[PDB]
PDB file of C-alpha atoms in Angstrom:
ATOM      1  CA  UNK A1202      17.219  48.685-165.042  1.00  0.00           C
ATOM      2  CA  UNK A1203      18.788  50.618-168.154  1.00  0.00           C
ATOM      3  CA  UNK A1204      15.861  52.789-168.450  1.00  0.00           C
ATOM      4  CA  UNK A1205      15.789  54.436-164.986  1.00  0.00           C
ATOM      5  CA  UNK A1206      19.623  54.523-165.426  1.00  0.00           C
ATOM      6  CA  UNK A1207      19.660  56.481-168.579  1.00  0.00           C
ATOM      7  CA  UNK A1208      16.696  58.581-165.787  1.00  0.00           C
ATOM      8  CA  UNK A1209      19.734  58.881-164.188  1.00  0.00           C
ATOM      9  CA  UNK A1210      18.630  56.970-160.584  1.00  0.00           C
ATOM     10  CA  UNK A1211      20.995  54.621-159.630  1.00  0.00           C
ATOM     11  CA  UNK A1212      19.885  51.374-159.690  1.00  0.00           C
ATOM     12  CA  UNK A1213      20.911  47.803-157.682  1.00  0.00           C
ATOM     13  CA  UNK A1214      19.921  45.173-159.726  1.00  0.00           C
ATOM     14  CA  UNK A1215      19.706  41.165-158.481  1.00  0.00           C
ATOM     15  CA  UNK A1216      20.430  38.597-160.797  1.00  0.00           C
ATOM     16  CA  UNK A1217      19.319  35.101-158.846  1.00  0.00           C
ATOM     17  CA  UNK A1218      21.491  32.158-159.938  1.00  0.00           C
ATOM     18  CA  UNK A1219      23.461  33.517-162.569  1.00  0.00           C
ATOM     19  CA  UNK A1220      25.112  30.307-163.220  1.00  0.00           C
ATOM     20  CA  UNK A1221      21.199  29.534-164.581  1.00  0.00           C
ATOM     21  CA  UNK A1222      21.823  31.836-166.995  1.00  0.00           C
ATOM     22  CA  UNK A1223      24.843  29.916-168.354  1.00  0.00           C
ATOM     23  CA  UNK A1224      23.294  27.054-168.322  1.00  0.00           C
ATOM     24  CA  UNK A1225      20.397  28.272-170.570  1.00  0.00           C
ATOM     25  CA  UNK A1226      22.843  29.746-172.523  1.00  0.00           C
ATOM     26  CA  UNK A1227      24.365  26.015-173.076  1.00  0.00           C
ATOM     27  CA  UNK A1228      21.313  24.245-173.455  1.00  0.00           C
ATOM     28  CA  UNK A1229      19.947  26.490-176.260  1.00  0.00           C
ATOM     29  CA  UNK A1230      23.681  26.302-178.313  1.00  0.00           C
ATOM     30  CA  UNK A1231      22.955  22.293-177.571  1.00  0.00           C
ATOM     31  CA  UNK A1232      19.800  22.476-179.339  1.00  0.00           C
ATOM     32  CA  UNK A1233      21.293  25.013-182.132  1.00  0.00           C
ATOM     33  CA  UNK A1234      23.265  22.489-183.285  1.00  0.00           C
ATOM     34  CA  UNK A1235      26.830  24.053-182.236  1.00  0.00           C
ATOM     35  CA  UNK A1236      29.449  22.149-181.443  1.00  0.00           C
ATOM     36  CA  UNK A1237      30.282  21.682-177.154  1.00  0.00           C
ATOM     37  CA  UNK A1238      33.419  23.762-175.610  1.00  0.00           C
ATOM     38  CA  UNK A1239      34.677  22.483-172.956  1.00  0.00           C
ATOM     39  CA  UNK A1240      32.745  20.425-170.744  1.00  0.00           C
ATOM     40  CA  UNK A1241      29.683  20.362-172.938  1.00  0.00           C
ATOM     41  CA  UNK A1242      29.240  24.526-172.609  1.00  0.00           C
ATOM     42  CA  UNK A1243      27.969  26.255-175.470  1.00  0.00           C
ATOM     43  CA  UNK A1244      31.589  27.956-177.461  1.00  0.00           C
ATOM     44  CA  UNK A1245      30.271  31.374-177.141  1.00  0.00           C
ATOM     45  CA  UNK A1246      30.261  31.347-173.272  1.00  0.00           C
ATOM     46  CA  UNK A1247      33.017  34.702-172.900  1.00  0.00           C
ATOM     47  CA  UNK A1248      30.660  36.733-175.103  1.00  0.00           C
ATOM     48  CA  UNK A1249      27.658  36.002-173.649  1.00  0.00           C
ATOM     49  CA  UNK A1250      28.746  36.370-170.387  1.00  0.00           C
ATOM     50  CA  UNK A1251      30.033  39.751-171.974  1.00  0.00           C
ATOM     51  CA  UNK A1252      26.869  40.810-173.536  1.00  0.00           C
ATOM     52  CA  UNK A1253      25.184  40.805-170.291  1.00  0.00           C
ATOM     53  CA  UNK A1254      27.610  41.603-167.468  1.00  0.00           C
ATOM     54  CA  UNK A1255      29.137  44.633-169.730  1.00  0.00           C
ATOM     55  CA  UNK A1256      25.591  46.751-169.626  1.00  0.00           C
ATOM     56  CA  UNK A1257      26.508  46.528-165.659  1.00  0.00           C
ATOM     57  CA  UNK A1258      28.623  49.637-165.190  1.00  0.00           C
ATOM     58  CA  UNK A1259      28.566  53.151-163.885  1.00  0.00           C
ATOM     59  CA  UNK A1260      28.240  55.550-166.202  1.00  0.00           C
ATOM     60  CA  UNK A1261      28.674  59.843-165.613  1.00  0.00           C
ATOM     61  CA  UNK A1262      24.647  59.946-165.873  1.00  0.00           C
ATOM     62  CA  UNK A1263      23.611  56.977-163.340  1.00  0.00           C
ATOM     63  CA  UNK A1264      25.293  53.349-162.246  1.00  0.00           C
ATOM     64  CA  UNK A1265      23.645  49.736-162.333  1.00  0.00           C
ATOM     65  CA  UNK A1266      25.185  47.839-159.129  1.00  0.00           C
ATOM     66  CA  UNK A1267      24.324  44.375-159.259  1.00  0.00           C
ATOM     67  CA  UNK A1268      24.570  41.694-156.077  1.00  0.00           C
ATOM     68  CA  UNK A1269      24.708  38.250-157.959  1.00  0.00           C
ATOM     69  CA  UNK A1270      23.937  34.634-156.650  1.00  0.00           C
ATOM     70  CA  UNK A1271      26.014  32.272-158.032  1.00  0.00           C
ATOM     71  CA  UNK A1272      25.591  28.426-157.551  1.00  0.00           C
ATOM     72  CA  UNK A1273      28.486  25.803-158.358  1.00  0.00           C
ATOM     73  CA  UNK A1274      27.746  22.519-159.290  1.00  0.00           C
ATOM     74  CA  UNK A1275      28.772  20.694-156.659  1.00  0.00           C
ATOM     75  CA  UNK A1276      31.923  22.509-155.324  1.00  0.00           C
ATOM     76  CA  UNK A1277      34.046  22.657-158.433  1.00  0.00           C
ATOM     77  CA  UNK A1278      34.954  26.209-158.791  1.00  0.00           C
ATOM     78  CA  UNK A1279      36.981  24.712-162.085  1.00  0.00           C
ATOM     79  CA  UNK A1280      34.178  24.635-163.888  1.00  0.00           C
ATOM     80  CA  UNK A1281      33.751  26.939-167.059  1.00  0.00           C
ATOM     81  CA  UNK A1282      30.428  28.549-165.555  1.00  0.00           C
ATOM     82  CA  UNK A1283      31.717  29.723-162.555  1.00  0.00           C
ATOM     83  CA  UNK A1284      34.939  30.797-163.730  1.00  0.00           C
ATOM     84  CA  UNK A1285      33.076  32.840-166.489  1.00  0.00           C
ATOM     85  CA  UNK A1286      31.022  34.323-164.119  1.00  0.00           C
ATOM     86  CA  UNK A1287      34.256  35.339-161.158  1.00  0.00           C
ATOM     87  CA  UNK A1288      35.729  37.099-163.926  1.00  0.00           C
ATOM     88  CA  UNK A1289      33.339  39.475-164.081  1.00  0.00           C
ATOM     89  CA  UNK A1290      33.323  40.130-160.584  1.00  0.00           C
ATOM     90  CA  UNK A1291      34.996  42.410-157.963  1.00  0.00           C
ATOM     91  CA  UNK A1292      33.419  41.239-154.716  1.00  0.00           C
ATOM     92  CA  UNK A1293      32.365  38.089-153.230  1.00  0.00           C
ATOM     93  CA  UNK A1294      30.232  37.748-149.725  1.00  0.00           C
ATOM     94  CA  UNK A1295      29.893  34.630-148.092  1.00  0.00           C
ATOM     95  CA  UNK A1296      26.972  34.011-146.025  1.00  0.00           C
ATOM     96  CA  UNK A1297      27.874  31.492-143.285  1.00  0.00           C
ATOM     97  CA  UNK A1298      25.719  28.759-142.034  1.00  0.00           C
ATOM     98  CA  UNK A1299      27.328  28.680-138.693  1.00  0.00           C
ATOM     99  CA  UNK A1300      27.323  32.820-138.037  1.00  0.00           C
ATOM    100  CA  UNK A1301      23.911  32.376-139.044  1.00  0.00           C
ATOM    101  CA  UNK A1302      22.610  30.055-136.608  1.00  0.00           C
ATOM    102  CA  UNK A1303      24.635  32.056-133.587  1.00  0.00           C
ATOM    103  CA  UNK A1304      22.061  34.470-133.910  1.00  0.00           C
ATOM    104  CA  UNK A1305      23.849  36.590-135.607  1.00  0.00           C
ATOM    105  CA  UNK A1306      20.968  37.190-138.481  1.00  0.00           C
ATOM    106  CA  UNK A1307      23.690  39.260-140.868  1.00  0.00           C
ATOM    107  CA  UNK A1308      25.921  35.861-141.833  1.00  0.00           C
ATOM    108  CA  UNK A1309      28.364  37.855-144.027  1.00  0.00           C
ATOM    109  CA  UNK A1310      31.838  35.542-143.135  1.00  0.00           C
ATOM    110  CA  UNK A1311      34.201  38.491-142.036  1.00  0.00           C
ATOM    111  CA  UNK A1312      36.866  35.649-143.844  1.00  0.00           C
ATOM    112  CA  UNK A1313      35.856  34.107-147.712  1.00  0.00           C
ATOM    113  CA  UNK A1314      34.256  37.827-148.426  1.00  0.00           C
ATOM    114  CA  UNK A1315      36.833  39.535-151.119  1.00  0.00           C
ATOM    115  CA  UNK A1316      36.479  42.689-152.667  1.00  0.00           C
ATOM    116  CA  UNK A1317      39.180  44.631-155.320  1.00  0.00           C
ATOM    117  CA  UNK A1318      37.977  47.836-153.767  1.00  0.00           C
ATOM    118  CA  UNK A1319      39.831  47.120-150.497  1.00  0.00           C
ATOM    119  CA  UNK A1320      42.767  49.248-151.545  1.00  0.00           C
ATOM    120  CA  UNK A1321      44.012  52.368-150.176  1.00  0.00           C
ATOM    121  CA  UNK A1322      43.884  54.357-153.596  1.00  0.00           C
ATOM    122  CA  UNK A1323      39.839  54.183-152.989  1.00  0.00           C
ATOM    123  CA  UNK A1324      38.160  53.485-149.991  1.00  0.00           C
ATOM    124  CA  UNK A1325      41.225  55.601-148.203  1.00  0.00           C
ATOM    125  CA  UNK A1326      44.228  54.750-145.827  1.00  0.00           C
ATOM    126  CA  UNK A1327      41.750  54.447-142.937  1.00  0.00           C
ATOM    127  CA  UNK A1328      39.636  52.370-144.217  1.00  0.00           C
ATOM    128  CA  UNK A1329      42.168  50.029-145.505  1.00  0.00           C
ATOM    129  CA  UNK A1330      43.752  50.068-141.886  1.00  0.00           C
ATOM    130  CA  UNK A1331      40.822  49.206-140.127  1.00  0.00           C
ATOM    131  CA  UNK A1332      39.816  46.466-142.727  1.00  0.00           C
ATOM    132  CA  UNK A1333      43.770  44.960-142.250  1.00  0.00           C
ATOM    133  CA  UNK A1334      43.558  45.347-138.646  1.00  0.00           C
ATOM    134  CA  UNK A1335      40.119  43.386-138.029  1.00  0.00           C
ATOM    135  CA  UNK A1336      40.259  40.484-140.209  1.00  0.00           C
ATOM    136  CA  UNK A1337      43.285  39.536-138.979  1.00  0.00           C
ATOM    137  CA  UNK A1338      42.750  38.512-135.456  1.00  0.00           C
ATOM    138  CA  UNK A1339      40.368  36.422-137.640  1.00  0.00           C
ATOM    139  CA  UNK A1340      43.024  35.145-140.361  1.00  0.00           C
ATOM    140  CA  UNK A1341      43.366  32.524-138.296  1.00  0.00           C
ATOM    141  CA  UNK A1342      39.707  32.291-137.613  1.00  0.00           C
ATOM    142  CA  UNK A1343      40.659  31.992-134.308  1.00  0.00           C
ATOM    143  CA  UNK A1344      42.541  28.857-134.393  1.00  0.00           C
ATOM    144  CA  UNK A1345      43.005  29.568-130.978  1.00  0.00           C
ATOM    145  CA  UNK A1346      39.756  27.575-130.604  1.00  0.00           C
ATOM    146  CA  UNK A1347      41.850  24.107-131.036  1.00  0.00           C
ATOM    147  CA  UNK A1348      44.144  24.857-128.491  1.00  0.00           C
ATOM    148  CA  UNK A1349      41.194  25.680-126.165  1.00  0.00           C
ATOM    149  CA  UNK A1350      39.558  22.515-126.681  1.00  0.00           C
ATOM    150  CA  UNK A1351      42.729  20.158-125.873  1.00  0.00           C
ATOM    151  CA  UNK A1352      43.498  22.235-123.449  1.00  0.00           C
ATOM    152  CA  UNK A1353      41.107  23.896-121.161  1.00  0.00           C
ATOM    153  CA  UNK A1354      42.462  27.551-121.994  1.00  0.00           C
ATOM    154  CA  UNK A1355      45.469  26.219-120.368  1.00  0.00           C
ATOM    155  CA  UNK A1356      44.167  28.113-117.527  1.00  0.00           C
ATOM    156  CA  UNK A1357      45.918  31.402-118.589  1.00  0.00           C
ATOM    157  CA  UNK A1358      46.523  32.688-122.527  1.00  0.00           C
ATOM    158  CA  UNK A1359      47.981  35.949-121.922  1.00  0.00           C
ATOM    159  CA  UNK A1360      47.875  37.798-124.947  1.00  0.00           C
ATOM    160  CA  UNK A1361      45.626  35.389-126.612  1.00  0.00           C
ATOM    161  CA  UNK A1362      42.973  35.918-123.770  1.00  0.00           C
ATOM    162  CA  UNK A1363      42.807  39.536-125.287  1.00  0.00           C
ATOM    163  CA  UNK A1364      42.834  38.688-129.077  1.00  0.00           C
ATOM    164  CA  UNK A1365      40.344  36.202-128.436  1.00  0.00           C
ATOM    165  CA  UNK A1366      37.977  38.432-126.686  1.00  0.00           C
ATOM    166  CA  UNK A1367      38.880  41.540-129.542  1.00  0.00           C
ATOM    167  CA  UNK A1368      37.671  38.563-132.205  1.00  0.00           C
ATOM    168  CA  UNK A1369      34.581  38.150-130.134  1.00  0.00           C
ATOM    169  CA  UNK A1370      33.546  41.326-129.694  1.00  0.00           C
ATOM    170  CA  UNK A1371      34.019  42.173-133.173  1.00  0.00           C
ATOM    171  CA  UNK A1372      32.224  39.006-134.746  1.00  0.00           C
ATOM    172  CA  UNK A1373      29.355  40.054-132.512  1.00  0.00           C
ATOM    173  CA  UNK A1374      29.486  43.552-133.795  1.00  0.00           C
ATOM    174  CA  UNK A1375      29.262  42.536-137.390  1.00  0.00           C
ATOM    175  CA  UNK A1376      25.486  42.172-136.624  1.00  0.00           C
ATOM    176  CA  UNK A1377      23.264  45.193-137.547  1.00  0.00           C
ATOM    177  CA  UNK A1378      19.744  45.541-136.882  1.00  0.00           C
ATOM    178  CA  UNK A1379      17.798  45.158-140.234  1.00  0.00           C
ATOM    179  CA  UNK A1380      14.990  47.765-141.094  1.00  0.00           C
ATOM    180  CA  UNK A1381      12.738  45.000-143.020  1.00  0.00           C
ATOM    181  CA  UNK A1382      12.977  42.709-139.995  1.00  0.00           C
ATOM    182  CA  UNK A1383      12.088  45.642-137.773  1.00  0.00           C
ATOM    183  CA  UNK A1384       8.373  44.169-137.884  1.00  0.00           C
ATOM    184  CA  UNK A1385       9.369  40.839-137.333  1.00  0.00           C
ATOM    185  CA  UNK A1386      12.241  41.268-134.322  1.00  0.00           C
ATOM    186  CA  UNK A1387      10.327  44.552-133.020  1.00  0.00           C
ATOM    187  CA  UNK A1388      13.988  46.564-133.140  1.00  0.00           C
ATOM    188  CA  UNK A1389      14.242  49.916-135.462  1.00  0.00           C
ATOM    189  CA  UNK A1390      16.950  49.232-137.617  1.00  0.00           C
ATOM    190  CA  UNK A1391      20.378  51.700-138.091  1.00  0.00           C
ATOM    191  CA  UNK A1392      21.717  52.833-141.184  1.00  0.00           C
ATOM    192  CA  UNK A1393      25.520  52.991-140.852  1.00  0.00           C
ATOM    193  CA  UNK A1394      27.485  54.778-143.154  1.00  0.00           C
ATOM    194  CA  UNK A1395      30.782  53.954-144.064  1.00  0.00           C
ATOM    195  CA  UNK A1396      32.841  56.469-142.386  1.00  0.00           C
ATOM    196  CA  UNK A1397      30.698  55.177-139.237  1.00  0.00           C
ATOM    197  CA  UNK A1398      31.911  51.899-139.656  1.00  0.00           C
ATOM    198  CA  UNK A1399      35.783  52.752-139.786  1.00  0.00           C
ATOM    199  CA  UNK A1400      35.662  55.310-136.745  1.00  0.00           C
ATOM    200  CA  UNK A1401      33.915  52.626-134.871  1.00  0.00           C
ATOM    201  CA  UNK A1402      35.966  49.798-135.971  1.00  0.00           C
ATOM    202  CA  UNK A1403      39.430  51.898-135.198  1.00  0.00           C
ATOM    203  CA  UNK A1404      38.222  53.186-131.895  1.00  0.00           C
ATOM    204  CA  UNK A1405      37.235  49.333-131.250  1.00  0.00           C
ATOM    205  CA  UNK A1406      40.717  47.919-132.420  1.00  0.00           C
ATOM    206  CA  UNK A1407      42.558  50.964-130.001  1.00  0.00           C
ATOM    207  CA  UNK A1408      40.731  49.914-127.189  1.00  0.00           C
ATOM    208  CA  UNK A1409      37.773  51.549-126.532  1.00  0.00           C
ATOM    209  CA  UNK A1410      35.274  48.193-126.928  1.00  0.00           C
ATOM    210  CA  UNK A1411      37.104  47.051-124.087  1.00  0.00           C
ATOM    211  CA  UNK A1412      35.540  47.004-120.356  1.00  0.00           C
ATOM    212  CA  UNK A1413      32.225  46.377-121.952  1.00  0.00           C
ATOM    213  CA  UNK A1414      31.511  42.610-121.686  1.00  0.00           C
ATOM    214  CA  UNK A1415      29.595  41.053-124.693  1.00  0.00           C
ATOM    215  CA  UNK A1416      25.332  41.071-125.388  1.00  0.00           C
ATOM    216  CA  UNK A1417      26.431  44.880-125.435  1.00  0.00           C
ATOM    217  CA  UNK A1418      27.808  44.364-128.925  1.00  0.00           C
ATOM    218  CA  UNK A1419      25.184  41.909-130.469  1.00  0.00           C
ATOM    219  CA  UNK A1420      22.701  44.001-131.925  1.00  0.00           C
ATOM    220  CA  UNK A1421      23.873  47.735-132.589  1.00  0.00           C
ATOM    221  CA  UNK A1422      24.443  50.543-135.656  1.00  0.00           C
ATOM    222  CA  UNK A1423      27.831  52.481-133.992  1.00  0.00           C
ATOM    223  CA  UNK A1424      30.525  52.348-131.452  1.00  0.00           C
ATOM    224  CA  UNK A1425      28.719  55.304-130.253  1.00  0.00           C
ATOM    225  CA  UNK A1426      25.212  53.594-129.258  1.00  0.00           C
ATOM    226  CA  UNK A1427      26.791  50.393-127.673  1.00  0.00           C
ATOM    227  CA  UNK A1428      28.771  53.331-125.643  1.00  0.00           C
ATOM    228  CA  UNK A1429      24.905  54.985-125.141  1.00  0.00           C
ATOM    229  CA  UNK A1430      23.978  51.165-124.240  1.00  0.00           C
ATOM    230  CA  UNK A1431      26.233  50.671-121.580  1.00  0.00           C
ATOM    231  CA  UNK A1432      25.741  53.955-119.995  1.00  0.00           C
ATOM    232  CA  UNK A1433      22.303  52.863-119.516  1.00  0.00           C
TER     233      UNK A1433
ATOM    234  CA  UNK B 587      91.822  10.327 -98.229  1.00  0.00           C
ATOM    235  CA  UNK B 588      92.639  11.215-101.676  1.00  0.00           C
ATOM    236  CA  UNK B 589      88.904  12.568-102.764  1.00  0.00           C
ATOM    237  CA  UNK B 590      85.529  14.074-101.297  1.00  0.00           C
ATOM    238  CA  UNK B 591      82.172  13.511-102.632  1.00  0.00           C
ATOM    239  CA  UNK B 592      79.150  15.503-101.201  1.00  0.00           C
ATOM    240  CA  UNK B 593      75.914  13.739-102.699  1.00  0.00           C
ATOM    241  CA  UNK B 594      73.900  16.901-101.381  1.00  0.00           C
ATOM    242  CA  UNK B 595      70.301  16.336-102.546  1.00  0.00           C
ATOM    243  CA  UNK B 596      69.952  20.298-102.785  1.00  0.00           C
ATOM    244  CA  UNK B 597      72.040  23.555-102.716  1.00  0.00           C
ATOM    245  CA  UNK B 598      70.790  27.250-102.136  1.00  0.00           C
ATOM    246  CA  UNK B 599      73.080  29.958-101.092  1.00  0.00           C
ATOM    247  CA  UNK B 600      76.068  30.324-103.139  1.00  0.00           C
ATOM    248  CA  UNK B 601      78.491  33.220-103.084  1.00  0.00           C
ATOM    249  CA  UNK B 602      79.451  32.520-107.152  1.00  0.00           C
ATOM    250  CA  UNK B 603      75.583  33.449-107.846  1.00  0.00           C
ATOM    251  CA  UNK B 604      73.521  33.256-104.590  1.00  0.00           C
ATOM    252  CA  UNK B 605      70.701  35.610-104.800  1.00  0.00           C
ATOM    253  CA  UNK B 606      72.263  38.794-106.363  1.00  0.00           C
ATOM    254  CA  UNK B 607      74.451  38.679-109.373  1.00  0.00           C
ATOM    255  CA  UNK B 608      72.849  34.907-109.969  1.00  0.00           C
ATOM    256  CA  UNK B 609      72.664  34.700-113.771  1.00  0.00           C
ATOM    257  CA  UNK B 610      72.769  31.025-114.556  1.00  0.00           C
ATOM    258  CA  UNK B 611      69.832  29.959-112.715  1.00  0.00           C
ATOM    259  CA  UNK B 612      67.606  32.990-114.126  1.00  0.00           C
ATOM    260  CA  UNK B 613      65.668  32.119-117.079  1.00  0.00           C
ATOM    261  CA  UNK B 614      66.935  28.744-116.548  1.00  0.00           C
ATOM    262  CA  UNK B 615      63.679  27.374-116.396  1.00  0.00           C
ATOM    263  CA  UNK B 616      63.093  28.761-119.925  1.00  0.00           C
ATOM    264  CA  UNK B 617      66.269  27.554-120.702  1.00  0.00           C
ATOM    265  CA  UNK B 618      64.765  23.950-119.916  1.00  0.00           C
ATOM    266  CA  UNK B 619      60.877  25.230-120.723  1.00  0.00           C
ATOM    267  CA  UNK B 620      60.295  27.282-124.169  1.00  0.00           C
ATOM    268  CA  UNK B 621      62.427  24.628-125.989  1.00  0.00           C
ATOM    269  CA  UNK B 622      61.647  21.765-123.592  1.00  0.00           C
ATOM    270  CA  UNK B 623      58.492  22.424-121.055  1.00  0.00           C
ATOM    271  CA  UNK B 624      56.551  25.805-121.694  1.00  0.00           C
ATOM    272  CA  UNK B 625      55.435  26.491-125.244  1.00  0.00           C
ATOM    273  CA  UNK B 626      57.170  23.216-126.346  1.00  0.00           C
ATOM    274  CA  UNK B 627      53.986  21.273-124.524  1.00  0.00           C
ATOM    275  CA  UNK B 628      51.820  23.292-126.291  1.00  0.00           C
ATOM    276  CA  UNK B 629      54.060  23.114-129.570  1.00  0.00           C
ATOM    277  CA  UNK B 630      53.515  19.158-129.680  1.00  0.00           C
ATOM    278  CA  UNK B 631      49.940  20.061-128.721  1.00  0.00           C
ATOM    279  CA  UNK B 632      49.521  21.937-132.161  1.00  0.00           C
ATOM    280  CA  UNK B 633      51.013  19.472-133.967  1.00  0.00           C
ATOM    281  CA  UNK B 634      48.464  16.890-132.255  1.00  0.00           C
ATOM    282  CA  UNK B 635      45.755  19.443-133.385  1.00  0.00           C
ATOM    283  CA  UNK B 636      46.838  20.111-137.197  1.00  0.00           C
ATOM    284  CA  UNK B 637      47.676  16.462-137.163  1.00  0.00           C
ATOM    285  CA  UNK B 638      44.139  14.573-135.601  1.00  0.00           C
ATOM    286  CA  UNK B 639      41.983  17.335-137.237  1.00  0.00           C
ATOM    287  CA  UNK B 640      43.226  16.572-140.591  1.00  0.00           C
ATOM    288  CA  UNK B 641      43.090  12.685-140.178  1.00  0.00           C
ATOM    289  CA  UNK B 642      39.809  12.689-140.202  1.00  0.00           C
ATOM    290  CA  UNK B 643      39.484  14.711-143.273  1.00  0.00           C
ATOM    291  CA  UNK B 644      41.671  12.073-145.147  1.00  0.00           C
ATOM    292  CA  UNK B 645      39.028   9.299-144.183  1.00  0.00           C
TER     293      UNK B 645
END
């Protein structure tokens, strides 16, 4: 990836099971005869995590982006490998079992998916807005759903009615059609740039979504073709 | 002959309050609902929710 970066093309590089790596790493100082840190991991864990993860920057000339997997034993997230790994990190996405099985194919969690880039002295005011604004009729990810189940809706939610169908719509807008599965679900996909995304997410938080029932959100690039959509 | 006791079951029309100027008797219910019957049912509700959800957790 270095070489076409010092060609100056920016390059998005996949690491699969970076933990892996770390483990490799503390097998081999096992077998080199040094002495265990920590829970058995080899003592030079920092700078080898360094070594790697530090040739994974943006330069002036070209930028390596990388989209790590990372795998915890079990589910401790105390472990040295792991916590090696998170501090070189500055966004997390959390692919969903249960988003992915609604049919929703992307199963990015709109909760448990982190980034240090959503700040206003980057992305932009707007963007942080609409990224504050949605995501929180989902803090709660909808724990509206309890009271719904003891209690029939109660018949009448008000407000909550409204939230909850604002959550809904936007959970099925999260979906966007995928030009690789275009063969496969016979649907072209969209490319949606970002300022797309925040005009269509702040016109959906103001209102506009509204009087367009759901299935019109599922599978769509912009505000502007679900509005084309229902139109037709 | 010394005291009168009306054991009305009901009273309506009452020049103190009556229908205009009646103050006590609106948002009475709430009075007797957010704290006792609306919201409060579903306030014991949610802590029958956080409560059951979580007991299972603990097993």
């Amino acid at each position: 990836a270095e070489y076409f970066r010092d060609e100056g093309r920016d390059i998005l590089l996949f690491i699969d099971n970076i933990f892996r790596f770390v483990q490799a790493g503390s097998e081999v100082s096992s077998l080199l005869g040094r002495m265990p840190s920590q829970v058995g991991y080899q003592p030079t864990l920092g700078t080898e995590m360094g070594e790697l993860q530090e040739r994974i920057t943006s330069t002036k000339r070209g930028s390596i982006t990388s989209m790590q997997a990372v795998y915890v034993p079990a589910d401790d997230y105390t472990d040295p490998a792991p916590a090696t790994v998170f501090s070189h990190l500055d966004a997390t996405i959390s692919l969903e079992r249960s988003i992915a099985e609604r049919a929703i194919f992307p199963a990015v969690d709109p909760l448990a998916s982190t980034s240090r880039i959503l700040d206003p002295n980057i992305v932009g005011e707007e963007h942080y807005r609409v990224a504050q604004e949605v995501k929180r009729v989902l803090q709660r990810y909808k724990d509206l759903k309890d009271i719904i189940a003891i209690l029939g809706m109660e018949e009448l939610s008000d407000e909550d009615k409204l939230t909850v169908q604002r959550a809904r719509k936007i959970e099925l807008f999260f979906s966007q059609p995928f030009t690789v599965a275009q063969q496969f679900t016979g649907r072209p996909g969209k490319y949606v740039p970002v300022k797309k995304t925040v005009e269509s997410f702040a016109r959906l938080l103001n209102g506009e979504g509204d009087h367009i029932p759901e299935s019109f959100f599922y599978m769509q690039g912009d505000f502007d073709d679900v509005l084309a959509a229902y139109e037709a | 002959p010394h005291r009168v006791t009306i054991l009305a079951d009901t009273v309506e029309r009452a020049d103190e309050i009556d229908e205009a100027r009646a103050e006590q008797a609106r948002a009475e219910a709430e009075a007797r609902r957010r704290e006792a019957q609306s919201e409060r049912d579903m306030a014991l509700a949610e802590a029958k929710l956080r409560k059951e959800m979580v007991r299972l957790r603990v097993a």
